[PDB]
Design a protein around this ligand. Structure first.
Ligand SMILES: [Cu+2]
Length: 105
């Protein structure tokens, strides 16, 4: 169900809460900006079950999470080869802004 993955945690912490998410075969996920902007999430160009790009960046979304309290509940299809995908926050590298969804059942 649209579970919320916030981009940062308490007063400072700039991580993915949660980070490793096993959802359903075609569930809904929520992306909320918590700290230091802006956050765009691109998917597994390199790390996905059927090593493709085409679809990977057709799942990942770029909505420049920049305003303090920006939550975008989004949904996936029911095929998404039921594996551990990987979404990273474009301008925030080093500072662990990366997450994984398992579209399994
Ligand atoms: Cu970020």
């Amino acid at each position: 169900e649209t579970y919320t993955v916030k981009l940062g945690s308490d007063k400072g912490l700039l991580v993915f809460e949660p980070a490793k998410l096993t959802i359903k075969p075609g569930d809904t996920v929520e992306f909320l900006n918590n700290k230091v902007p802006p956050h765009n999430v691109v998917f597994d160009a390199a790390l996905n079950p059927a090593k493709s790009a085409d679809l990977a960046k057709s799942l990942s979304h770029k909505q420049l999470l920049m305003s303090p309290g920006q939550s975008t509940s989004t949904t996936f299809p029911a095929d998404a080869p039921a594996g551990e995908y990987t979404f990273y926050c474009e301008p925030h590298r080093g500072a662990g802004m990366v997450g994984k969804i398992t579209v399994a059942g």
